[PDB]
Design a protein around this ligand. Structure first.
Ligand SMILES: *Cc1cc2c(cc1C)nc1c(=O)[nH]c(=O)nc-1n2C[C@H](O)[C@H](O)[C@H](O)COP(=O)(O)OP(=O)(O)OC[C@H]1O[C@@H](n2cnc3c(N)ncnc32)[C@H](O)[C@@H]1O
Ligand SMILES: *Cc1cc2c(cc1C)nc1c(=O)[nH]c(=O)nc-1n2C[C@H](O)[C@H](O)[C@H](O)COP(=O)(O)OP(=O)(O)OC[C@H]1O[C@@H](n2cnc3c(N)ncnc32)[C@H](O)[C@@H]1O
Ligand SMILES: NS(=O)(=O)Cc1noc2ccccc12
Ligand SMILES: NS(=O)(=O)Cc1noc2ccccc12
Lengths: 499, 494
């Protein structure tokens, strides 16, 4: 029944919020729909794999909030394998390389690739992290899809193809599905193209020893009986002095304030009294989550390392079920494994198959890309299709279709009377990620502390000290990268000389 | 507790389904979230207006199901006033005209406008009404917004602006918000451009005497206490022998089958056991409804008729709050009124204002367009902003953003175990309209009759005889309309 704050959702965001409030001396309850905490993070444990992240997994430099939270909880990280060569597979052939970006030899194509990434970041700098709708050309950019933007920007098929894979991989959506403004924001608020795509010095640098599900699990341990499992919230009533929150299993909770720590669209599963204001009422029907199946194929040994491949594969082509892989071998060197993502339309397409049929297709793909018959000899397989999850809606995160972010974006984290909004989607730095979940949960909690008169306004948003364990190398460019012309820029130079 | 079929939603679709099953001898229950029936139709009564439709209102030729159902319930129609001239207001000036399409005089603009409408219908002929995802170019057209298609097709700003207004008015959404495939299907499944945009001989020909709300109300009258108001459904359990349906007010209903007669996305408000299949789980997060405020300004007399204007105004440009109006005067000539729609982003923008502030803006606009100071003296005002409705999600209907119809369209009316799907969004003819609501409700009911072995498979979909009261006249084109070149076509001849 009675408490100070009800937190709806026991993912990382809700758990971070609840922990902050609890540490501050408030009486909190977490109402979680599932029989587990963690949400879009889920660490499976069994004898064949020991542990494996089937949801969110990677952390990296500049993600200082998740690193600090996890450290405080007693967790350690380890580095994802990137010792050996990466592979870019294009038009049925594999091209090994080093560094974050697949190399390009053709001079025209090089100019086009260089300009593409540069332009993504150039446009990003126009977009405020905390208010993307305030970009000078917000409306123009929001009214085109990423497909349209790539069609304008990429003068080569090679760049367009790689850029398409980049979009699919980052946001588990097709280029024609998403707003250009929103995607440009999404990349910029992660620190830009280099930071978001990189393993070493980027978002995919590390994993947690024992899995990311431990973050939510250990917070549940600290909170004890305050976390209520299998309590899906169905109804929130703010007409009276205290907020009333009802669950599906017929329980009533009474609170001063509520934090909604669920994906924005999943707010639809709750009936509101009084009704939500118009803008939020419509916003939550306009913000779908992407589509992905995370697949892990296990092997006797990490055989790819012997061929001087680290296990990273960037795989372009409609035929390929998986467009991106990483080595998922344990830091001890055992439970050898390749993690792969089946993205966007392919997640829909290949969901029809059996688990065994997907495993077969993945092994045949990996065998070709790695030029290795050993890839046809898996010892185990695990997968999770996040599209089937009633209480997630998809993965990794919420995307915005054309026109939505400028029209409805401002209400994402606008409080509704005594309801405050957390969830990674409401973050301003690494929104979409575990990092964003922590930022949003702690910010929502502090909004409530401010409303109660416990902290001053300037303490709602708080900076985070850089991790001493995971230092961030700055993102740098070369003179040539900065000043080489685009393809149309070069054509202009040609036309002017011929005058 | 126990019945044969639970119908979720007491709009026209839910009511039509429940009536059909009831008339077949089954025990039905309608569970309705609101304290009223009708859903996206709502007729307000007071002394000042007598009655006014604040939701869906118009019916016309080829909408034979809604006309038949209404007639059976004892309703009659009257004609929307289109005796005098229509107005197209462009670049701050009113241009009166007759016929469905505003005329264009510049020869280049003429070719461009002609080609736009013609191309819309040309593309539509390749889109199956019952399976738009089966169009030969389904993926190409679905991966494009209407904004992109218009940018490609329209060589003049004039055609592009009118095309844009057309999209905004038809589907209460911006051209950049909606899939080209879906929009082309939408127009085609209403019978094409002329049929959808026409008052005389089209969708806006008629209104119901006493209001469209009477359709749902009179079915509720028939069903009596089988309709349960203020029963929002929260939970559907299909794990046992009988389907269990729970409401927010704690009641439990048990049935052999369920009809979901709510907008697809409002399916999100229900917790499912077992969970929905993946495709429907994601589909219902991908399908928003449009944005509109319906506004009716009342006057002492239908003064526009004195200047040989019928009251229809097509008003281009960002500045105008309302882009389209119709005469809403009653058949007797009293309760003189102009109905206007505030569409899409303008509904979002102008919702911030007070009711009185919106009235002033509309009156000043109408004064300019009609060229009459009489527009500045309203006697009454009614409005409804459908964006604020928890149990609608918007109006008029659900739109599909780029990429969604091809990926998820097929699951719209695919049954989920013992749940069948009604609602105008699942119709194949006038989906989005009251007509589509009737089609889908009766089809879903007949799917259940077939599942029970009461009727054969070929009786699930049923043709409708043409209304005797509202017969359809054929849509025609002229030789020149069919064969005049596009702008780039004329350029290739140069
Ligand atoms: C799924 C996924 C996610 C992911 C990714 C790969 C996949 C396959 N890779 C990531 C990565 O490598 N690194 C990273 O930092 N993030 C990655 N992501 C995304 C990440 O998992 C998410 O950003 C993060 O987990 C989100 O946390 P948040 O707390 O904001 O949100 P949530 O996990 O979805 O938790 C919400 C909880 O609420 C419960 N719920 C839902 N509805 C209700 C109702 N009505 N009542 C009560 N509880 C409700 C959910 O069950 C959930 O626990
Ligand atoms: C709003 C609007 C609609 C409209 C239009 C102009 C406006 C402003 N003009 C139209 C017109 O001139 N001619 C026409 O034929 N249609 C026009 N439209 C659209 C039309 O009103 C709709 O197509 C039609 O009314 C839709 O009917 P349908 O039966 O398919 O759907 P509904 O009216 O939305 O009814 C659904 C009912 O379900 C209830 N509900 C929602 N959730 C629940 C839950 N969880 N549990 C129980 N009941 C639920 C709703 O409250 C509603 O009553
Ligand atoms: N963090 S992850 O690998 O689970 C998904 C992901 N988001 O953005 C990326 C950019 C490049 C490679 C992967 C990703
Ligand atoms: N049926 S209505 O008037 O409520 C909305 C409507 N849909 O498509 C149209 C085309 C021209 C004018 C109006 C409309």
């Amino acid at each position: 029944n009675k408490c100070d704050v009800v937190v709806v959702g026991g993912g990382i965001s809700g758990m971070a919020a609840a922990k902050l409030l609890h540490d501050s001396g408030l009486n909190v309850v977490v109402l979680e729909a599932r029989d587990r905490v963690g949400g879009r993070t889920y660490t499976l444990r069994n004898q064949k794999v020991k542990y494996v992240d089937l949801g969110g997994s990677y952390v990296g430099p500049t993600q200082n909030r998740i690193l600090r939270l996890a450290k405080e909880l007693g967790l350690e990280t380890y580095k994802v394998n990137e010792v050996e060569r990466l592979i870019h597979h294009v038009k049925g052939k594999s091209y090994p390389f080093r560094g974050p970006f697949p190399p390009v030899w053709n001079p025209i194509t090089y100019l086009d690739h260089n300009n593409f990434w540069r332009t993504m970041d150039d446009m990003g700098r126009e977009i405020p992290s905390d208010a993307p709708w305030k970009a000078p050309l917000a409306e123009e950019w929001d009214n085109m899809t990423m497909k349209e933007l790539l069609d304008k920007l990429c003068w080569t098929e090679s760049a367009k193809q790689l850029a398409t894979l980049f979009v699919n991989l980052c946001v588990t959506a097709e280029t024609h599905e998403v707003s250009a403004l929103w995607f440009l924001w999404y990349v910029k608020q992660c620190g830009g193209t280099t930071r978001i795509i990189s393993t070493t010095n980027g978002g995919q640098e590390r994993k947690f020893v024992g899995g990311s599900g431990q973050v939510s699990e250990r917070i549940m341990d600290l909170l004890g009986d305050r976390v209520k499992l299998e309590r899906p919230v169905i109804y929130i009533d703010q007409t009276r002095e205290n907020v009333l929150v009802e669950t599906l299993n017929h329980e009533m909770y009474e609170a001063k304030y509520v934090i909604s720590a669920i994906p924005p669209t999943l707010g639809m599963k709750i009936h509101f009294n009084p009704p939500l204001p118009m803008m939020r009422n419509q916003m939550i029907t306009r913000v779908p989550l992407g589509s992905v199946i995370k697949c892990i194929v296990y092997y006797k040994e990490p055989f790819w390392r012997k061929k001087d491949y680290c296990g990273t594969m960037i795989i372009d082509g409609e035929e390929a079920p998986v467009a991106y892989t990483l080595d998922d071998t344990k830091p001890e060197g055992n439970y050898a494994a390749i993690m792969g993502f089946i993205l966007a339309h392919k997640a829909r397409k290949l969901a029809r198959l059996t688990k065994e049929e997907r495993l077969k297709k993945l092994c045949e793909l990996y065998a070709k890309v790695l030029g290795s018959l050993e890839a046809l000899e898996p010892v185990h397989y695990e997968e999770k299709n996040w599209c089937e999850e009633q209480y997630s809606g998809g993965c990794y995160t919420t995307y915005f279709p054309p026109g939505i972010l400028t029209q409805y974006g401002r209400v994402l984290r606008q409080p509704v009377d005594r309801i405050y909004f957390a969830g990674t989607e409401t973050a301003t730095h690494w929104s979409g990620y575990m990092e964003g979940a922590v930022e949003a949960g702690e910010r929502a909690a502090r909004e409530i502390l401010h409303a109660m008169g416990k902290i001053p306004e300037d303490e709602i948003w708080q900076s985070e000290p850089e991790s001493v364990d995971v230092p961030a190398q700055p993102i740098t460019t070369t003179f040539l990268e900065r000043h080489l012309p685009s393809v149309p820029g070069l054509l202009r130079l040609i036309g002017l000389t011929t005058i």
